[PDB]
Design an enzyme around this catalytic site. Structure first.
Site, PDB file in Angstrom:
ATOM      1  N   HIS A  68       8.692   6.663  -3.528  1.00  0.00           N
ATOM      2  CA  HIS A  68       9.582   7.465  -4.403  1.00  0.00           C
ATOM      3  C   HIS A  68       9.796   6.775  -5.730  1.00  0.00           C
ATOM      4  O   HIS A  68      10.951   6.677  -6.194  1.00  0.00           O
ATOM      5  CB  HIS A  68      10.900   7.764  -3.706  1.00  0.00           C
ATOM      6  CG  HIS A  68      10.739   8.846  -2.703  1.00  0.00           C
ATOM      7  ND1 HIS A  68      10.606   8.580  -1.387  1.00  0.00           N
ATOM      8  CD2 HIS A  68      10.609  10.182  -2.842  1.00  0.00           C
ATOM      9  CE1 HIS A  68      10.463   9.705  -0.726  1.00  0.00           C
ATOM     10  NE2 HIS A  68      10.462  10.706  -1.592  1.00  0.00           N
ATOM     11  N   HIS A  72       5.003   8.376  -8.534  1.00  0.00           N
ATOM     12  CA  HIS A  72       5.252   9.638  -7.804  1.00  0.00           C
ATOM     13  C   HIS A  72       5.720  10.665  -8.826  1.00  0.00           C
ATOM     14  O   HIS A  72       5.201  11.785  -8.825  1.00  0.00           O
ATOM     15  CB  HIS A  72       6.284   9.455  -6.691  1.00  0.00           C
ATOM     16  CG  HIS A  72       6.751  10.755  -6.138  1.00  0.00           C
ATOM     17  ND1 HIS A  72       5.969  11.515  -5.328  1.00  0.00           N
ATOM     18  CD2 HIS A  72       7.898  11.457  -6.320  1.00  0.00           C
ATOM     19  CE1 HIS A  72       6.625  12.620  -5.013  1.00  0.00           C
ATOM     20  NE2 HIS A  72       7.812  12.617  -5.618  1.00  0.00           N
ATOM     21  N   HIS A 106      12.508  14.394 -11.102  1.00  0.00           N
ATOM     22  CA  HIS A 106      12.975  15.049  -9.863  1.00  0.00           C
ATOM     23  C   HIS A 106      13.492  14.004  -8.868  1.00  0.00           C
ATOM     24  O   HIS A 106      14.187  14.387  -7.920  1.00  0.00           O
ATOM     25  CB  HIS A 106      11.885  15.950  -9.283  1.00  0.00           C
ATOM     26  CG  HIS A 106      10.907  15.242  -8.416  1.00  0.00           C
ATOM     27  ND1 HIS A 106       9.946  14.426  -8.940  1.00  0.00           N
ATOM     28  CD2 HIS A 106      10.753  15.214  -7.073  1.00  0.00           C
ATOM     29  CE1 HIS A 106       9.218  13.941  -7.948  1.00  0.00           C
ATOM     30  NE2 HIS A 106       9.678  14.409  -6.795  1.00  0.00           N
ATOM     31  N   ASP A 107      13.114  12.741  -9.008  1.00  0.00           N
ATOM     32  CA  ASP A 107      13.428  11.708  -7.984  1.00  0.00           C
ATOM     33  C   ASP A 107      14.122  10.516  -8.651  1.00  0.00           C
ATOM     34  O   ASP A 107      14.192   9.449  -8.012  1.00  0.00           O
ATOM     35  CB  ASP A 107      12.173  11.286  -7.216  1.00  0.00           C
ATOM     36  CG  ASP A 107      11.984  12.033  -5.910  1.00  0.00           C
ATOM     37  OD1 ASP A 107      13.000  12.498  -5.379  1.00  0.00           O
ATOM     38  OD2 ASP A 107      10.814  12.130  -5.415  1.00  0.00           O
ATOM     39  N   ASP A 217       5.575  18.342  -5.434  1.00  0.00           N
ATOM     40  CA  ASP A 217       6.203  17.183  -4.763  1.00  0.00           C
ATOM     41  C   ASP A 217       5.342  16.800  -3.573  1.00  0.00           C
ATOM     42  O   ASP A 217       5.261  15.616  -3.297  1.00  0.00           O
ATOM     43  CB  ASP A 217       7.637  17.505  -4.352  1.00  0.00           C
ATOM     44  CG  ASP A 217       8.532  16.321  -4.020  1.00  0.00           C
ATOM     45  OD1 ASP A 217       8.105  15.161  -4.141  1.00  0.00           O
ATOM     46  OD2 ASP A 217       9.673  16.585  -3.669  1.00  0.00           O
ATOM     47  N   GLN A 269       1.214  13.508  11.329  1.00  0.00           N
ATOM     48  CA  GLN A 269       0.530  14.045  10.132  1.00  0.00           C
ATOM     49  C   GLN A 269       0.075  15.471  10.429  1.00  0.00           C
ATOM     50  O   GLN A 269       0.386  16.354   9.608  1.00  0.00           O
ATOM     51  CB  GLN A 269      -0.577  13.106   9.644  1.00  0.00           C
ATOM     52  CG  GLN A 269      -0.053  11.987   8.737  1.00  0.00           C
ATOM     53  CD  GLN A 269       0.680  12.586   7.563  1.00  0.00           C
ATOM     54  OE1 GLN A 269       0.062  13.223   6.723  1.00  0.00           O
ATOM     55  NE2 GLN A 269       2.006  12.478   7.531  1.00  0.00           N
TER      56      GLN A 269
HETATM   57  C1  LIG Z   1       9.833  18.028   7.897  1.00  0.00           C
HETATM   58  N1  LIG Z   1       8.793  17.223   8.639  1.00  0.00           N
HETATM   59  C2  LIG Z   1       8.221  17.852   9.899  1.00  0.00           C
HETATM   60  C3  LIG Z   1       8.377  15.942   8.129  1.00  0.00           C
HETATM   61  O1  LIG Z   1       8.919  15.500   7.088  1.00  0.00           O
HETATM   62  C4  LIG Z   1       7.346  14.985   8.770  1.00  0.00           C
HETATM   63  C5  LIG Z   1       7.234  14.913  10.205  1.00  0.00           C
HETATM   64  C6  LIG Z   1       6.357  14.028  10.868  1.00  0.00           C
HETATM   65  N2  LIG Z   1       5.568  13.214  10.143  1.00  0.00           N
HETATM   66  C7  LIG Z   1       5.588  13.192   8.781  1.00  0.00           C
HETATM   67  C8  LIG Z   1       6.460  14.051   8.019  1.00  0.00           C
HETATM   68  N3  LIG Z   1       6.407  14.003   6.579  1.00  0.00           N
HETATM   69  C9  LIG Z   1       5.408  13.451   5.790  1.00  0.00           C
HETATM   70  O2  LIG Z   1       4.363  12.900   6.242  1.00  0.00           O
HETATM   71  C10 LIG Z   1       5.638  13.614   4.327  1.00  0.00           C
HETATM   72  N4  LIG Z   1       6.861  13.944   3.875  1.00  0.00           N
HETATM   73  C11 LIG Z   1       7.201  14.179   2.605  1.00  0.00           C
HETATM   74  C12 LIG Z   1       8.655  14.563   2.315  1.00  0.00           C
HETATM   75  C13 LIG Z   1       9.869  13.683   2.738  1.00  0.00           C
HETATM   76  C14 LIG Z   1       9.582  14.967   3.517  1.00  0.00           C
HETATM   77  C15 LIG Z   1       6.198  14.059   1.635  1.00  0.00           C
HETATM   78  C16 LIG Z   1       4.872  13.713   2.017  1.00  0.00           C
HETATM   79  C17 LIG Z   1       4.577  13.510   3.400  1.00  0.00           C
HETATM   80  N5  LIG Z   1       3.318  13.148   3.869  1.00  0.00           N
HETATM   81  C18 LIG Z   1       2.395  12.569   2.976  1.00  0.00           C
HETATM   82  C19 LIG Z   1       1.192  11.988   3.411  1.00  0.00           C
HETATM   83  N6  LIG Z   1       0.350  11.496   2.512  1.00  0.00           N
HETATM   84  C20 LIG Z   1       0.604  11.546   1.209  1.00  0.00           C
HETATM   85  N7  LIG Z   1       1.738  12.071   0.763  1.00  0.00           N
HETATM   86  C21 LIG Z   1       2.655  12.570   1.596  1.00  0.00           C
HETATM   87 MG   LIG Z   2      13.069  13.675  -3.590  1.00  0.00          MG
HETATM   88 ZN   LIG Z   3       9.514  13.579  -4.897  1.00  0.00          ZN
END
Ligand SMILES: CN(C)C(=O)c1ccncc1NC(=O)c1nc(C2CC2)ccc1Nc1cncnc1
Ligand SMILES: [Mg+2]
Ligand SMILES: [Zn+2]
Ligand SMILES: [Cl-]
EC number: 3.1.4.17
Length: 313
Positions: A68, A72, A106-107, A217, A269
């Site tokens: 973050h 980003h 945004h962050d 995002d 993932q």
């Molecule tokens: C809501 N829900 C099911 C989940 O949040 C989730 C659950 C189980 N595992 C992973 C999860 N989230 C992410 O992996 C993830 N989350 C965000 C934002 C904060 C929520 C952004 C990116 C993400 N992956 C990523 C991979 N590689 C590059 N960039 C981002």
């Molecule tokens: Mg944010």
């Molecule tokens: Zn963000």
């Protein structure tokens, strides 16, 4: 006035593509962003002396956290720039100016913890803002930097173009609260299948801009696999840190954040790509057809994760 920014050839070309990586050289990211404003918006619509000072005050207020961070911000700005330049006619002079700034800010001042962790820790910001804690904090920090002397890039807007633009930025920043994304897409789907979706309905644009922001995002998942996989580390370093911090408050964290449950990532993932990313970019393509490259690339990476599970990497 006549001070164009140019980029090295490969950058000048690859920047126009959704899957562009802004690279490992911190010191070029500000040029890249100015470049994007000048091509996306016009060479005029911000005073350079003021933009550059905004950019550097913005960079100054992002922290050295694994995901973050300042990179980003600029990644998310870029992805928004790719959408604006492929949907040229659909967006107003101001929608272009405010959205790129929205993405960069945004962050602002993110500490590397979810809204959840603020509530269970009982952080002051959870007392001051009951929902979209960090997101209301981020919008707040944006207005602070805009009111520093010599930082009002909007100076020359009218009173009403100013409130129009600060209100675009505020909803845009709030919409990066993924907890709101789910309702926002359900409603947008329901309005595109029934055929009620109307981009002259202000409340309808709001939602669409809302989802673009979710899409921008989440755009680390729309990169080439080697970018996506290496970003996944960064997002997991914050997750495992927050897990550590949940355990310290004497709470067992969700497994996504438990660094003992590292084995279970690829499945998580998958879960994420099916619950969030494929839907987001599916609905975003439906609404904005030229953004299909984001869906295509997202799908590719889901496939790449299916191979990790299947022991093929
Ligand atoms: C809501 N829900 C099911 C989940 O949040 C989730 C659950 C189980 N595992 C992973 C999860 N989230 C992410 O992996 C993830 N989350 C965000 C934002 C904060 C929520 C952004 C990116 C993400 N992956 C990523 C991979 N590689 C590059 N960039 C981002
Ligand atoms: Mg944010
Ligand atoms: Zn963000
Ligand atoms: Cl153009």
């Amino acid at each position: 006035g006549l001070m164009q920014f140019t980029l090295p050839v490969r950058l000048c070309k690859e920047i126009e593509l959704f899957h562009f990586d802004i690279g490992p050289f911190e010191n070029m990211w500000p040029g890249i962003f100015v470049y994007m404003v000048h091509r996306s918006c016009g060479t005029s619509c911000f005073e350079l002396e003021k933009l550059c000072r905004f950019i550097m005050s913005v960079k100054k207020n992002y922290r050295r956290v694994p995901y973050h961070n300042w990179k980003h911000a600029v990644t998310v700005a870029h992805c928004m720039y790719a959408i604006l330049q492929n949907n040229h006619t659909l967006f107003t002079d101001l929608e272009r100016k405010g959205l790129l700034i929205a993405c960069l800010c945004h962050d602002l001042d993110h500490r590397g913890f979810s809204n959840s962790y603020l509530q269970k820790f009982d952080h002051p910001l959870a007392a001051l803002y009951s929902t979209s804690t960090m997101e209301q904090h981020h919008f707040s920090q944006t207005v602070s930097i805009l009111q520093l002397e010599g930082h009002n890039i909007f100076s020359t807007l009218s009173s009403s173009e100013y409130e129009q633009v600060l209100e675009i930025i505020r909803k845009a920043i709030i919409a990066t609260d993924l907890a709101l994304y789910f309702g926002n897409r359900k409603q947008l789907e329901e309005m595109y299948q029934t055929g009620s979706l109307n981009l002259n309905n202000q409340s309808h644009r709001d939602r669409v801009i809302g989802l673009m922001m979710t899409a921008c995002d989440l755009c680390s998942v729309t990169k080439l696999w080697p970018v996506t996989k290496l970003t996944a580390n960064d997002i997991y370093a914050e997750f495992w840190a927050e897990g550590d911090e949940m355990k310290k408050l004497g709470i067992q964290p969700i497994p996504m954040m438990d660094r003992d449950k590292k084995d279970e990532v690829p499945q998580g993932q998958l879960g994420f790509y099916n619950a969030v990313a494929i839907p987001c970019y599916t609905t975003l393509t439906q609404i904005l057809p030229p953004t299909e490259p984001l869906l295509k690339a997202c799908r590719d990476n889901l496939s790449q994760w299916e191979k990790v599970i299947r022991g093929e990497e």
